[PDB]
Amino acid sequence: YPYCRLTDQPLSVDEVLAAVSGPEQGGIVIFVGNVRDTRLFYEAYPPMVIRTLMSIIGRCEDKAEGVRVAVAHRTGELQIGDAAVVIGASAPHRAEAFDAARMCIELLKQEVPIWKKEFSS
Amino acid sequence: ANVVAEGAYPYCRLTDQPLSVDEVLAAVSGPEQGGIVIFVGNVRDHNDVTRLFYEAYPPMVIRTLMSIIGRCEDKAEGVRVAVAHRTGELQIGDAAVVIGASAPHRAEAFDAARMCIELLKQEVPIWKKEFS
Numbered sequence: 001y002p003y004c005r006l007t008d009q010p011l012s013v014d015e016v017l018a019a020v021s022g023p024e025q026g027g028i029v030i031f032v033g034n035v036r037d038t039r040l041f042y043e044a045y046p047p048m049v050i051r052t053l054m055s056i057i058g059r060c061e062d063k064a065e066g067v068r069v070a071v072a073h074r075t076g077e078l079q080i081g082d083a084a085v086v087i088g089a090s091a092p093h094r095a096e097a098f099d100a101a102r103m104c105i106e107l108l109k110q111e112v113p114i115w116k117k118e119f120s121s
Numbered sequence: 122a123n124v125v126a127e128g129a130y131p132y133c134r135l136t137d138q139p140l141s142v143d144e145v146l147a148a149v150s151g152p153e154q155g156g157i158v159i160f161v162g163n164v165r166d167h168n169d170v171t172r173l174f175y176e177a178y179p180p181m182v183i184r185t186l187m188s189i190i191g192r193c194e195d196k197a198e199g200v201r202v203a204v205a206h207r208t209g210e211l212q213i214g215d216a217a218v219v220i221g222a223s224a225p226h227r228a229e230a231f232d233a234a235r236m237c238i239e240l241l242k243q244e245v246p247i248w249k250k251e252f253s
């Protein structure tokens with residue numbers, strides 16, 4: 001199965017990178033979505049979100065041969081500098097890894113149902 | 122062997138040692154960088170060892186990389202690009218290049234990363250041979 005995580009813990013670039021690596025993957029694209037410049041919370045129902053993430057991964061891998069996609073999304077409280085999402089896509093060639101990573105994040109942004117809360121301490 | 126531009130310098134590293142995603146990632150991170158894209162170009166197999174060298178003097182290659190970075194950064198506001206490049210003897214699976222690009226938003230980060238690798242491949246001349 002693909003690497004597909006929804007967690008309250010800091011995301012791992014190492015893990016996403018490893019999930020997507022392999023002898024035949026010449027190109028790897030990794031997207032990191034960081035929190036920019038006050039408290040921030042992500043609230044989600046994990047079963048629904050994870051299912052949605054799996055759907056997205058399947059559609060992205062479907063575009064070209066040898067394409068591997070991994071996704072990690074964070075929930076809970078976040079700080080400036082924290083990764084909210086980490087996406088990895090690999091392919092024999094760089095074009096297909098760029099295509100899959102970009103497709104993955106656009107779909108995620110459009111589809112993953114999430115509540116965003118902002119208040120001030 | 123390692124040469125790296127640190128501080129205010131744009132991140133540029135030439136080495137014969139294993140590359141690091143984390144270092145490149147840190148190099149383009151910032152309070153206002155909301156979207157970050159990393160490209161890793163790996164040695165893959167076509168039926169086990171690859172030797173890679175510059176066709177030019179390393180300082181010439183650095184000038185080239187620094188110029189490429191400048192141009193990629195000039196395309197939009199808040200764009201940061203970083204390049205790590207490895208030569209010598211590499212294994213199947215080894216990273217030959219790690220590129221990082223960041224920006225306030227994701228679109229410019231993807232643009233910068235893609236532009237960077239494209240300019241690199243057409244402007245940085247590399248001696249490449251496969252061995253057994």
Ligand SMILES: [Ca+2]
Binds near residue numbers: 249
């Ligand atoms: Ca050549």
